[PDB]
């Protein structure tokens, strides 16, 4: 379940000193807009985006689940 995903990924990103743009890399898999929507809870994370983000932040997806 991914209801608290946005807050956790924002915390971990800020911890690692990364901007949203750095997480999104070439934006081929994730736009900065989409990451912003997930972090604020505007958009529910989908599986492909959640797994991409977890990998970019260096953790298994299980670190970020509810």
């Amino acid at each position: 379940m991914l209801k608290d995903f946005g807050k956790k990924i924002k915390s971990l990103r800020l911890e690692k000193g990364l901007t949203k743009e750095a997480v999104c890399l070439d934006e081929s898999q994730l736009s900065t807009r989409q990451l912003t929507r997930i972090e604020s809870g505007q958009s529910t994370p989908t599986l492909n985006k959640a797994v991409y983000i977890a990998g970019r932040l260096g953790v298994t997806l299980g670190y970020l689940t509810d």
């Binding site: 081929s28 807009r33 912003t36 958009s43 989908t46």
Partner: protein, 60 residues
């Protein structure tokens, strides 16, 4: 990539209002939407498209 569920949620939550919406395409494929308050970079290609036609295309 834009999931049909993501688009439908943006409509349900009242972020995508009205009959048309701004769309970013990459490699011919729908890649994202753009809300009025959001920004796009210079290399992103934005088109105004009909909400119902975007839904058709995403449902495929």
């Amino acid at each position: 990539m834009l999931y049909i569920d993501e688009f439908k949620e943006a409509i349900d939550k009242g972020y995508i209002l009205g009959d048309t919406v701004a769309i970013v395409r990459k490699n011919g494929k729908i890649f994202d939407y753009v809300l009025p308050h959001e920004k796009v970079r210079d290399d992103e290609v934005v088109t105004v498209e009909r909400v119902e036609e975007v839904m058709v295309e995403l449902d495929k």
